[PDB]
C-alpha cells in the first residue's frame, strides 16, 4: 500500500503557496517542484520520501576563473553554520548548491527562510 | 488566482513561478540551456531515484482520487 504519510511534503507545498498567493505549486511524477525565482534563479524542490527529508537544489553560476580551492572552500559551510552547501555534479556538468530540511523540522516559515538563505548563497556565488 | 507568488522573508521579496517551459523562455536566452540542464538533471539527483518516482506518482494518483470524492 501507499504510505499516506508521504503526502506530508504536498500538504506544506500547499499551504506555502497559500501563504505566497498564488496558484498551487505541486510536485511532480519524480517528487520534484521546478521553480524559476525572479527571472533569474534556477530552484528545485525534491522529496527525499526514504530519508525523511526535504531538498532545496539550484544552479550555482559561478565565474569560470573562481579557484576551485574558493568552491571548496564554499563546499564547508554546511559544517560552519548549518547554512547551504555547493559540490559539482559530474552528470551535468554543473554546480549546484543545496540544502536538506529533515521532515521533523519543516514548516512554511522553515522552508521560507531556507530558501531565501539558499537564494543569496546562490547570488553570492554568481558575482564572486 | 496569481501564477507568480510573493515570497517575503527578512526584509527581502522574491517572486516565484513554476518552471515549465514557457517560463523557462522568459530567462535571458543566454541563462536558458543551463537552465533546462539543470531541471532535466535535478529529479535525478538523488539516489534512489527509482524508487523516489515510484512512490510520487502513487501519491499524486491518492490525490486525483481524493479529487473525485468531492466531486
Same mark, same amino acid.
Given at each position: 500500500?501507499?504510505?499516506?504519510?508521504?503526502?506530508?511534503?504536498?500538504?506544506?507545498?500547499?499551504?506555502?503557496?497559500?501563504?505566497?498567493?498564488?496558484?498551487?505549486?505541486?510536485?511532480?511524477?519524480? $517528487?520534484?517542484?521546478?521553480?524559476?525565482?525572479?527571472?533569474?534563479?534556477?530552484?528545485?524542490?525534491?522529496?527525499?520520501?526514504?530519508?525523511?527529508?526535504?531538498?532545496?537544489?539550484?544552479?550555482?553560476?559561478?565565474?569560470?576563473?573562481?579557484?576551485?580551492?574558493?568552491?571548496?572552500? $564554499?563546499?564547508?559551510?554546511?559544517?560552519?553554520?548549518?547554512?547551504?552547501?555547493? $559540490?559539482?555534479?559530474?552528470?551535468?556538468?554543473?554546480?549546484?548548491?543545496?540544502?536538506?530540511?529533515?521532515?521533523?523540522?519543516?514548516?512554511?516559515?522553515?522552508?521560507?527562510?531556507?530558501?531565501?538563505?539558499?537564494?543569496?548563497?546562490?547570488?553570492?556565488?554568481?558575482?564572486? | 488566482?496569481?501564477?507568480?507568488?510573493?515570497?517575503?522573508?527578512?526584509?527581502?521579496?522574491?517572486? =516565484?513561478?513554476?518552471?515549465?517551459?514557457?517560463? =523557462?523562455?522568459?530567462? !535571458?536566452?543566454?541563462?536558458?540551456?543551463?537552465?533546462?540542464?539543470?531541471?532535466?538533471?535535478?529529479?535525478?539527483?538523488?539516489?534512489?531515484?527509482?524508487? !523516489?518516482?515510484? =512512490?510520487?506518482?502513487?501519491?499524486?494518483?491518492?490525490?486525483?482520487?481524493? !479529487?473525485?470524492?468531492?466531486?
Amino acid at each position: 500500500p501507499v504510505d499516506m504519510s508521504n503526502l506530508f511534503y504536498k500538504t506544506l507545498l500547499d499551504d506555502f503557496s497559500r501563504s505566497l498567493e498564488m496558484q498551487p505549486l505541486v510536485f511532480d511524477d519524480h $517528487g520534484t517542484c521546478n521553480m524559476i525565482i525572479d527571472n533569474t534563479f534556477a530552484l528545485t524542490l525534491s522529496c527525499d520520501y526514504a530519508r525523511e527529508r526535504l531538498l532545496l537544489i539550484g544552479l550555482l553560476e559561478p565565474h569560470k576563473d573562481i579557484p576551485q580551492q574558493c568552491l571548496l572552500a $564554499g563546499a564547508l559551510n554546511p559544517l560552519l553554520n548549518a547554512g547551504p552547501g555547493l $559540490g559539482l555534479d559530474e552528470k551535468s556538468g554543473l554546480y549546484h548548491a543545496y540544502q536538506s530540511i529533515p521532515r521533523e523540522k519543516l514548516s512554511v516559515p522553515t522552508l521560507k527562510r531556507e530558501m531565501a538563505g539558499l537564494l543569496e548563497w546562490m547570488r553570492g556565488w554568481r558575482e564572486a | 488566482l496569481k501564477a507568480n507568488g510573493q515570497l517575503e522573508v527578512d526584509g527581502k521579496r522574491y517572486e =516565484i513561478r513554476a518552471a515549465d517551459d514557457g517560463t =523557462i523562455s522568459v530567462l !535571458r536566452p543566454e541563462q536558458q540551456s543551463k537552465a533546462k540542464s539543470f531541471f532535466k538533471g535535478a529529479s535525478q539527483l538523488i539516489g534512489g531515484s527509482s524508487q !523516489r518516482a515510484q =512512490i510520487a506518482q502513487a501519491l499524486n494518483e491518492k490525490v486525483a482520487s481524493a !479529487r473525485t470524492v468531492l466531486h
